[PDB]
From a paper:
The defense-associated sirtuin 2 (DSR2) effector, a SIR2 domain-containing protein, protects bacteria from phage infection by depleting NAD+, while an anti-DSR2 protein (DSR anti-defense 1, DSAD1) is employed by some phages to evade this host defense. The NADase activity of DSR2 is unleashed by recognizing the phage tail tube protein (TTP). DSR2 is arranged as a dimer of dimers, which is facilitated by the tetramerization of SIR2 domains. DSR2 has a two-domain architecture, with the CTD responsible for sensing the infection signal and SIR2 acting to prevent phage propagation.
To elucidate the activation mechanism, we reconstituted the DSR2-TTP binary complex and analyzed its structure by cryo-EM. The outer sheet of the BS1 domain pairs with a stretch of residues (aa 903–910) in the H4 subdomain, while the inner sheet packs over the H3 subdomain. Two aromatic residues from the transition region, Tyr574 and Phe576, make hydrophobic and π-π stacking interactions with Ala9, Ala27, Ala30, Phe32 and Tyr175 from TTP. In addition, a loop segment (aa 493–504) of H2 transits into an α-helix in the presence of TTP. This α-helix of H2 subdomain fits snuggly into a pocket between the two slices of BS1, forming multiple hydrophobic contacts via Leu495, Leu497 and Leu498. Nonetheless, the inter-domain contacts between H2 and SIR2 appear to be weakened by the binding of TTP. Upon binding to TTP, the lid region shifts away from the active-site, possibly exposing the catalytic pocket for substrate binding. Together, it is reasonable to conclude that the TTP binding stimulates the rearrangement of the lid region, thereby activating the NADase function of the SIR2 domain.
Author numbering:
A (entry chain C): 304 to 349, 353 to 640, 643 to 1005
B (entry chain B): 304 to 349, 354 to 1005
C (entry chain A): 4 to 34, 51 to 74, 168 to 180, 190 to 211, 215 to 236
D (entry chain D): 5 to 33, 52 to 74, 161 to 177, 190 to 211, 216 to 236
Amino acid sequence: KDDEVIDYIYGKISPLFALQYIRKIDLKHVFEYDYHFEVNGTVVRHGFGYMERFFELKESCDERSKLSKKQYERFNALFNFFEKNGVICMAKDAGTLNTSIEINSLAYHGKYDVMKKFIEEQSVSIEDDYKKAFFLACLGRWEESYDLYSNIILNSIDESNGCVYYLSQINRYRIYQSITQAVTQFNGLGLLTFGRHYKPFTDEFLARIEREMTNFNIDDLFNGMPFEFQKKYKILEFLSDNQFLYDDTVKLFELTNKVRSEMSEGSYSFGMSSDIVVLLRLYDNLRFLYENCLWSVSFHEFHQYIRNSMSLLIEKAEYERTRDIDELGFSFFGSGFFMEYYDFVNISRHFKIDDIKNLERSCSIDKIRFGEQEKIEEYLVGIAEEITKQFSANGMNVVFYTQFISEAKAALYFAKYVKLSEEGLGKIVKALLFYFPERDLDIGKRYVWLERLTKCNELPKSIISIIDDFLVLQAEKHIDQNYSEVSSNGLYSRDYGALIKHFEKNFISKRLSEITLCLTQDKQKQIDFLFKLLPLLSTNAKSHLLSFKSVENINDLMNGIRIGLIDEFTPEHEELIIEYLETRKVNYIVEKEKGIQTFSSNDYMSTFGIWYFLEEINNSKMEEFIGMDDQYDFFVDPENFDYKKFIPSWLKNYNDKLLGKIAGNKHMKHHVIEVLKERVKNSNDKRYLEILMNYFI
Amino acid sequence: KDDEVIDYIYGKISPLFALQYIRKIDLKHVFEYDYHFEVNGTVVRHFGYMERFFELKESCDERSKLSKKQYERFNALFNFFEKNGVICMAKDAGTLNTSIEINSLAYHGKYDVMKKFIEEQSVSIEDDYKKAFFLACLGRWEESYDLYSNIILNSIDESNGCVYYLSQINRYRIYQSITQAVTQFNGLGLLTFGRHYKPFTDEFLARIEREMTNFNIDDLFNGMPFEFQKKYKILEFLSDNQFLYDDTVKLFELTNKVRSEMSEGSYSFGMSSDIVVLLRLYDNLRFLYENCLWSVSFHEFHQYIRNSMSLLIEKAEYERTRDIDELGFSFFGKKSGFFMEYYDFVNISRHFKIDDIKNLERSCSIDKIRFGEQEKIEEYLVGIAEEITKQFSANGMNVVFYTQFISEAKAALYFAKYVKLSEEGLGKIVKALLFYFPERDLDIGKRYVWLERLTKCNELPKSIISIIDDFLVLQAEKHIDQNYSEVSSNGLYSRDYGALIKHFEKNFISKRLSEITLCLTQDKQKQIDFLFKLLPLLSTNAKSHLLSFKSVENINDLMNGIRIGLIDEFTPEHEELIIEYLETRKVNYIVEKEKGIQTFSSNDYMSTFGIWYFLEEINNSKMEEFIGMDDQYDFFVDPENFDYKKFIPSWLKNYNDKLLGKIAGNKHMKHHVIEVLKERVKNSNDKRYLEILMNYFI
Amino acid sequence: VIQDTADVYFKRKSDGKLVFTAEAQTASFSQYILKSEKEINLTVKNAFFDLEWLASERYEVEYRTIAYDIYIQFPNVSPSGEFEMSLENGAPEIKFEALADTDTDEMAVVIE
Amino acid sequence: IQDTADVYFKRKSDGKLVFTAEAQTASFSILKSEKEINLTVKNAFFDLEWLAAIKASKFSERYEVEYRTDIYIQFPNVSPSGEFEMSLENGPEIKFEALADTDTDEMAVVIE
C-alpha cells in the first residue's frame, strides 16, 4: 500500500525529533544499514523499495493527497525534519547541489551580553536550564554551571527524558575534567605566568566533586541504561567513548592523503572531490556539536581537527590557484574558494598565532577574497567592546580570560584581510591600545598588530588621535625613574611616531609639548624617552629638548641618526665609533684564553660596516683593530672573506639599495651567485628567487 | 627486603613469556599504569619498584644473595627485558642506538624454506600455528583454514588460551580474506584475468559462511575467563573492528608536529618526533610479524607503513636540503643523516605501490640517499627472480598467491634501481624479468622502462646483451604470424632494446636474426615491418637484402628510416608525402567544421614536421599553403602570429637542449617565453622550470 | 560550462558489445627525430556489468559529457585492477591505462 | 656538541632558581632588526623553596634562562607565554620568548 510507506520510516526514526541536529553520516545507524546518505544529501541503496517511495511522494502532490490526517501529519513532520537536516533525494535523481552552513547558537557568535540577559531571565523548562548551564560554562562561571548540571541530572529521571539525562551526564563529566585541569594548571604554573597564586574554586568544591566523580567511566554509560533507549538512540552511542573524535581523525587523514596524492600527480577529479567531502564533514560536525549544546571548548582535539581541516582546505585552494593546465586538461577542466563569515570565525577561534603564521608561510591568504564583511566587522566590534568593557573596570573572570584572550588575539590578528569602517576601526584600535592586557601583548606585539591593521584601512584622523593619547599616557608612565619597557620584537615606543609620520608627515602633538616644556636636568628617564619622539613636537619644544641633552653617548648618536636629526655626519663621531671598536678588541684578547664566543644580539658593528660601504665614514684607523664578528669581511676586506659571515640570511635581511650596490662590485658577485643558485635549487623560498630575478642576473 | 623486589614483577608479568614479542608501549597495561616506558627503553615515574630491580643489574654483589628460585626469576626477567629492549631509567640513560631484527621466515620471503618446513612432520600446537601462517602466506588458503579450525578445536584441550584467542582472530581474518577474494574474482575478475577462475568450491564457502555467522571481532575478550582478562590485558586491543586506529591518530599528530617544525625551521633536541615515528613503526612491524598474525589481508597496515616511510623520507630530504645558519652547522656539522638499509628496502618494496614510489620520487630525491647492506638486498632480489622464474617456467601458478606476490615483485624490481648488483645476480634478474614475467602486468613499454632503469649503476655487460638478443629473437619469431601486434602503454616498443644495446655496444651484430631475415619473401609481411624496426642490429648484407624487399613508400617507414639513422640527408618526393598528408588533414578538416569535431589525436607528426622546419631541412612555401588549425605549428610557420599558447609550457620540459638553445636565439617570442617562465617559477615549485631559466635563458 | 560529471562506457573491441557503464572519477595525464612519452590513467566509480556480458582481448572507452556534445574516445585501453583485501567492508573503483598500437600512434581522441 | 642540554630558570631580583628542565625546541626567527627567539622545554620540577580577577598591569618580575651543554647559552630577559588548553586524556610543556630592553640591547649570549 502506498499509504503504508511512512509507517516504517516513522517506526524507525520517531525518537530522533528529541534533538536539535543530527549528522547525515550518523543516519546509518537509525535505519540499521539499509541505505547510505552522502554528505551532500543524495541517498544510495546498499527487499522492498523503501526510501524511494517517500521521495516519490514529494515530487507528486497528487499521490500524497490520499493520506489521512495522521498520515499527512507524519509526512509533514518527516519532510520538515529532512529539510532541517539536508536530506534531499536519491543520487540517480540528483542535480545541482549547493550547501550552506547555518549554525543557530548564541555561543558560536559570541553574544556575551545576550547570553547574560538570557541567564538572568526566568527558567521555563529542563531544556532551557540545559542551555543555561551551557551558557554559564561558556561565560566562565563554572561553579554555577556544575551545580545546574547536577540539578538537571537529578531531575531528568523525574521528568522522564533520557536524552537530557545522558547528555547532562556527559557534560558534567567534561566540565569536571575542565575544573580539574584548570586548578592543576593554576596551581603549579600560574605563579610564574600570572605573577600570583589564584585559586577561585575553594577546597569544599573540589572535595565534593572528586568524591562524586570517582568510578565514573565515560564508557559503559550506554550499556548501563534501558534497552529501549539502547535501541532508540543508537546514534548517540558513539558519544560515550574515551577515545572520542577518533573516526573523524582517521577519515581526515585518509582524505588528506588522497588530496596530497592528487596534488602531487596533478590529476583532475570529477564531481564531489575529496576537499568538498572534508568541508562538508567539518561543517556537519561543527553544527552537530554546537547546536546540541555540548561542552567541547574543553578539548584541544576538536581544535586540532578544525585546524587540520581548514589548513588542508586553504592549501588545496592555493594549489588550484597556482597550477598549470594542458589541452586535454582544458577539454576536461574548461569554482574558486573564498572566505566567508563562518570560516573567519572558525579560523579565529580554533587557530593559534603559530598556526596562522604557518598558514601565511605556506599559502597566500592575500589572494583569497573575503565576503560578508559586514558580519565580520560586527564580530570584531563585539570582541573589542567586550574586551574594553571588561578591562575598563575593576573586574575580570580569570577562567573566562584564559578561554577568551586567545580567541580575541587571533581575531585581531586575522582582521588584517578584512576591510572595516571608520567607527569600527576606531573602536577596535582604542580597545587594543588602551585596555588589552600587557602580559599578552607587549609594546612590540601591540605595534605589529596595529600596523598590520592599516594594510586596507589606511589611517584616518581618529586613529591618529588615539595613538596620540596612547603616547601621552606612555610619556606619563615614563615620569617614574624606575620604568623600562621590554619588547620581544625590537620595536619600541619610537614606532608609533614613525607610523604616524608615514601617513601624516606634517604633524605636531599639542599635549606632549607641555610635558616637554616642563622638564629639568634632574627629570631623567623622561628626557631619554622624549628623545625617541623628537619629530613629533613643535620646533621650539624640539630645541628646548635638545638643549638639555647632548649626543654624548652612542645610543643618542644612533637615535639622532634614526629620527633624521643628523643628516650630515659630524666630527668626534668616529671618535666614539673607534672607542667602541677598540674597547671591544681590548676585551677580546683577554677572553681568547677564556674562550667566550659572545655572539650577542647587538647589531652595532654590522651597521658600522654598512655605514663604511656608503663612504659616509671612511678612515684608516677603522680597520686598526677588527673585532670577533665575521661581518667585517664584507665592509673591511671583501677579498679576504670566509665560508660565510651571515650573508645567506642577510640578503633577505638587507634592503634594496645595499643589494643593488652588492650587484655593483668586483669579485664576491660570483660567490653570491653560486650560493644563490644553491639556495634556489635545493630549497623552496620566494625571497631567494626575487633577489635572483631583480638585483642579480 | 631487597630479595622481595622480584616477587611483584613476576607476579604481574608472569603471563607475558607466553608470547614471542611484546610492545614497549604495550607494557603500560601489564603494570596497571604505574610507570611509563618510552619507546626507546628508559622508564619514567608517573616506593621505587623497578628502580631497585634495575639497580640489581649494575651490581652483581647485591644480586648474589638471592636464592636459586630468585636467581632463576631474575635471569628470566633480565633475558626477557633484553629480548624486548627495556634497558634502564631515563635519569640514568645514556647513548642509545636501536636496531630492528625481525626473526620471521615470512618477512624475508623464504618460500622454499617455508615449503620445506610445511612438508616436515608436526611437533606441537605452536608449530601448527606457524604452519597455518606459512600456508596462508604461500597462497594455499583452504588448508590454512582447515589447520586454523583444528587448532581452535584442540587449543581448549591443550589448555593454552592465548593460542585459542589468536587462532580465532586469525581464522576470522582469513575468512574475510577468502570472502573478499571470491567477491573480487567473480566481478571485474572476468575482465582482468580474461577468464572466470574460482578456486574455492561451493562446499567450502557454504561451510564457512554458516560457521562464521554471528562471529563479532568485539566481545571476544569479554567472553573468556576473568583470569585471562586479568593476565592478558595487553592483547585486549586486538579484539576490535576499528583496529590499527590509535597508531593512525598518533602518526597524524607526529606528522603535524614534524610538518610544523619543517615550516618554522626549528631545532628539536634529543629524541625528535621522526625518531619516535621510526621506532613505533619498527615496534609495530616486529610485534605483528613475529607473532604470526594475518595482516597481509589489510590495506590499513600497508597504509600505515606507507605513511610512516613517506614521512621519514620527506623529513630526511628536509634535513639534507634545509637552509642552515651558524647554529645548525655547529650542532650538526658531521651530518649524521638518514640512510637506507635492508629492512627499509623490504618495507618499501612490500608496502608501496608504483604510484606511491613515483610520488616519493617526485617530492624527494632518493638518489642522494645512501643504501647499505647491499649484499642482503641482492640476495632478496635474486630470491624474488628465482621464485618468479620457477613459478612461470612450468605449467603452474597459484593465482591467489600470484595476486598477493606480483605487486611486491613489481615494486622490488622497480626499486632495485638504486642498488648496485653483481654480474650473476643482474643476469638472473634480467632473464627472469624478460622471459617469464607475465605480459598482463608488464607490457613491452613497462618492461623496457624497468630494464633501462636497472642500468643506472650496473651498466650493461655481455651476458645481459645476450639475454636481450634471445628476447629479440623470440619476439621476431612471435611476429611470424600475420595477426600479431604489440601495444605499449608508454609509447616505447620493441625498437628500443636495439637502441639500448647500441648505446653500450655501438659495434654489434646479431648472429640469429640474420637467418630469419635471410629467409624472407614478398609474402612474409608483418615480419619485414618488424625487422625494419631492428635494422641497425643486423649485418650489412642482411641490411641490403632487407631493404630490397621494402621501400620507403609510406610515412611510417619514412620516420623509421629517419629514426634508425638509415636516412641522414633528406631525399626528393619526401616533402611530397608530407604535403599529401598535410593536405588530406585539411581536406578532412574543413568538412568537419560544420560537424564540429575537435579531434585532438595523440599523433605527433605535425609538431615534428614543424621542428624539422626550424632546422631548415624542410624549407618550402607549400607547407604554409595550408594549416591544420593545430596550435603547435604557429611556432614553425609564423612565430609572430602566435596565440595564448600552443603547448609551450609543457614543451619546454618536453623539448631537448638543442631546440631550446635555438629558441633562445630568436627575435620576439623570447620575451613572451621569459614572462611565462617567470610566472611558472614564481607561482609553482618545479626544478625543471628552474633549469630552463638558469641554463638556456638569462 | 562542462558539468564536471561525465559518463563512461566500457565496451569490447573486436565485437562491440557493451561491457559496463560507470561515472568518471579521476583522469590523469602524464608527459630532430622527436618521440612521444605520455600516459593516460582513468579511474571510475561504482559500476555494474552488463547482464548479457556476464554469461588476449581489446576494449574501448567512451566519455560522454555536455558543456552548457562533448565526446572522449580511448580506442585501446587496459584494465589494471588490483586485489586489496581490507578491514570491515561487506562498489569499488576500476583503473584503466590508455594503450597505443604501433601502426597508428593514437591513444586519445576528443570530439566537440 | 651533545644533543641534550639543561635549562635553568632564575629570577632577576635575587638570582634564585625557579625551576630546572631539559630543552626540547629552540626557534630563531639607519639600520634596524626584528628577530624572535622562542624556547620550549620539557617536564620541569619547580624549586622546593620558590613555591612558598586580572588587571591590565605590568607589575611583573624579570627572569633569566641558562642553557648548559663547556657550552653556555644565556638569555638575560625572558617572558613565559603559558597557553591554557584542556585535553581529553587528562593525564608539562613550558614556552618562553626572549625579550630585550631599549638601551642595553642583548637577546642571546654564547660562551664557549
